[PDB]
Design a protein around this ligand. Sequence first.
Ligand code: G24
Ligand code: G24
Lengths: 116, 116, 116, 116
Amino acid sequence: CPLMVKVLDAVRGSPAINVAMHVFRKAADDTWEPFASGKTSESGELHGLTTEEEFVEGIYKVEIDTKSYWKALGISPFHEHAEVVFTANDSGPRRYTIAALLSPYSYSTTAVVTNP
Amino acid sequence: CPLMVKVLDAVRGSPAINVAMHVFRKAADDTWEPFASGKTSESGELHGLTTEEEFVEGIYKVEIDTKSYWKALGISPFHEHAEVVFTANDSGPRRYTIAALLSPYSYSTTAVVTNP
Amino acid sequence: CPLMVKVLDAVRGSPAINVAMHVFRKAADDTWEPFASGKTSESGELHGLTTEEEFVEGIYKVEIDTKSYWKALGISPFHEHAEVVFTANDSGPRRYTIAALLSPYSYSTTAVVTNP
Amino acid sequence: CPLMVKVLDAVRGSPAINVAMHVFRKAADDTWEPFASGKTSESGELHGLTTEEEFVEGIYKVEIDTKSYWKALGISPFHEHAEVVFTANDSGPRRYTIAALLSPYSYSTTAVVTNP
Ligand SMILES: Cc1cc(OCC(=O)O)cc(C)c1Cc1ccc(O)c(Cc2ccccc2)c1
Ligand SMILES: Cc1cc(OCC(=O)O)cc(C)c1Cc1ccc(O)c(Cc2ccccc2)c1
């Protein structure tokens, strides 16, 4: 996987399961073009969003539907969603893991970038 | 002062000074309208973005220009920016502090919401 | 005021109020001597732990009683406490703010160190 | 593994490699008895610290030598180490992943607790 997302839940102490997210690439006219999506597995992971050949340089956005997640748990959340916006592959193809830790009024996101 | 933003630098253990950010409000037609902007002070704070009367119910986005902050320090960070998107004043007027902690490959955001 | 602690609750989006904590200093014989203690205010802050004259060079530990905080809210959290252990004033007197963000299964801590 | 530790580096955007840590169990006299240790792999992971039979109820401390890690990178750190103190297995055996995200002046720790 050139791109993987891992989401944890800081209230339950667990992977965050069935969290939906969409991935966008910024177009030449500065709009966001959606191109992939999925929901996290029982281990809080989403794999298989893109392939090496398709995942060219550019600016990418991952929009994580954290609000639906907290709603499903009966917990009032602050954010509409969690975004991660980044330039990919600036100096060549990299493997990216986006890690997110969710609380109702806070989130953190981190990137693990490895050169395959 | 109903909306304040505080930004810290996790590398230097300091306020993040001179960090630009723009606030937007979602309009009735669903586009992001410019709402306010400013840069953090020497204490990493930005106050005076809005007033109670102007800060009506709605979905607000704060886009924090973290990339320029890192680039000015010589660092090429992962994120293009840090976004915070939230519904405000859904249950009457509240005071919001958005707190952000910055590292080159990670950021966290939290909200303190108080009732005046 | 050379040492201040600020504690936020990531579940409620509020200061963490009435959080007890104890500060220790490592002694010449390597044991932890009691240094100061207190509980956070309604603003999640604890000030007045020490003075510039008393806060000499050394290794200090702040043990924050996060378990009691969660238990009083009905929650059985993961951590017994949050610890912050650091060398202080190694390069002359500094002002330290210890910031902690709490969730039932996670906590984060950061330091803001300023030169007066 | 009943106990795994995963450490990431928020400055380099990578697993935190060759981070040493020690694990202690609290004794009846309230002292900490060390019983396991290791250093993180190239993927920032430490496995094999204990076995199901040995990992009985009690209070456990993981002391992560973050200071040596930052020193090895030529970066000035704030903390002496990062601690994680928790009661294990309170309601039966669980699998524990302790996740830590490191910055020079901040760290976060989270637990993923799964029932095997
Ligand atoms: C626990 C784990 C399993 C995991 O499995 C997938 C794999 O091994 O590739 C991957 C990662 C990066 C992790 C670590 C992790 C997950 C979410 C996350 O936000 C972080 C960073 C973090 C850690 C502690 C507190 C706040 C943030 C690490
Ligand atoms: C909101 C605030 C009020 C505050 O009042 C006291 C003062 O102004 O000195 C001080 C600080 C450092 C803060 C910011 C703050 C509080 C806790 C805390 O963990 C952090 C770092 C952080 C920020 C976002 C997500 C995780 C961690 C900052």
